[PDB]
Amino acid sequence: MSTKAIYPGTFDPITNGHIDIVTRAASMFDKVVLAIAASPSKKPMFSLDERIALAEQATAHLVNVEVIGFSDLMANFARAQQANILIRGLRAVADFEYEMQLAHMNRHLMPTLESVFLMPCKEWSFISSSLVKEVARHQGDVSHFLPANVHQALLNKLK
Amino acid sequence: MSTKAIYPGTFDPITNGHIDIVTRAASMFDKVVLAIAASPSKKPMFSLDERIALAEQATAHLVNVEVIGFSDLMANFARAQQANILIRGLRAVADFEYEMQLAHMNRHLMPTLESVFLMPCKEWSFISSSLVKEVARHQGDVSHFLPANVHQALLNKLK
């Protein structure tokens, strides 16, 4: 009943793994905002506008998904968006501790916000989006891991 | 716009941690079945009928939650119940690998079934049916961890 979720991340760039997560989120909640962090601590390969553009194209086929940049705490953005659900992808064990921490902090910041964890398809279990960049930087075939539009934009960035 | 989840487990017995998980599940999905495994491999302290009774009482305040026994694979029961969502409590990093395995198997058995992972409230982050029972078996105060009705039943089982 009127479920609204945010799916925050850097999405530098968005990968088939992300698409899978947001697709499955969009299948179980009424609305999903794919929230792109504006000022990440790490210098991203793509600008906020570029990242939004690529994500938009890659998720245009999802009716109930909307891309939006944000610069605040993901907890504050969720409050502004009147989201009661926070989507987090769970790839590996190492990340689990951090994700527990973040959920407990987010509970502290906004107790009505519910963190929800999804695992990726086996296909995308071992892709990193930093391993994808790194492989691409040193001239490898990453076509299987990215949406066509994203792959093109990445090829251009390495010239 | 329609969501039906199962939350499978042995629930021998149901704890505050379980109640917390199913409560949060019930807040974000239209219907939630608290599915109690009939014949766990291990011999449970309480019978299926007892485990149903205690869980019923302890979830009677949740309108859209229904307790049901099952004896098949959780993936088949989900198919029977027309569940598209499977709730898993994800407390320990140790259990994460197993949970990843299970979701991959459950995706094999029923591809339309979406595994969803929730982390407990900090308060219940360290409790298990097993450690509660063990403490209680050697005469310790477990009142904080169990619904009153469950606590009473457990005291009687050990006296």
Curated annotation (Swiss-Prot), chains A, B:
The record marks 18 as: Transition state stabilizer. Its cofactor is Mg(2+). Homohexamer. GO terms for biological process: coenzyme A biosynthetic process. It catalyses: (R)-4'-phosphopantetheine + ATP + H(+) = 3'-dephospho-CoA + diphosphate. This is Phosphopantetheine adenylyltransferase. Belongs to the bacterial CoaD family. ATP binds at residues 10-11, 18, 89-91, 99, 124-130. It is an enzyme of class 2 (transferase). Keywords: ATP-binding, Coenzyme A biosynthesis, Cytoplasm, Magnesium, Nucleotide-binding, Nucleotidyltransferase, Transferase. The lineage of its organism: Bacteria, Pseudomonadati, Pseudomonadota, Gammaproteobacteria, Enterobacterales. Substrate binds at residues 10, 42, 74, 88. Reversibly transfers an adenylyl group from ATP to 4'-phosphopantetheine, yielding dephospho-CoA (dPCoA) and pyrophosphate. It comes from the Bacteria. Pathway: Cofactor biosynthesis; coenzyme A biosynthesis; CoA from (R)-pantothenate: step 4/5. It is found in: Cytoplasm.
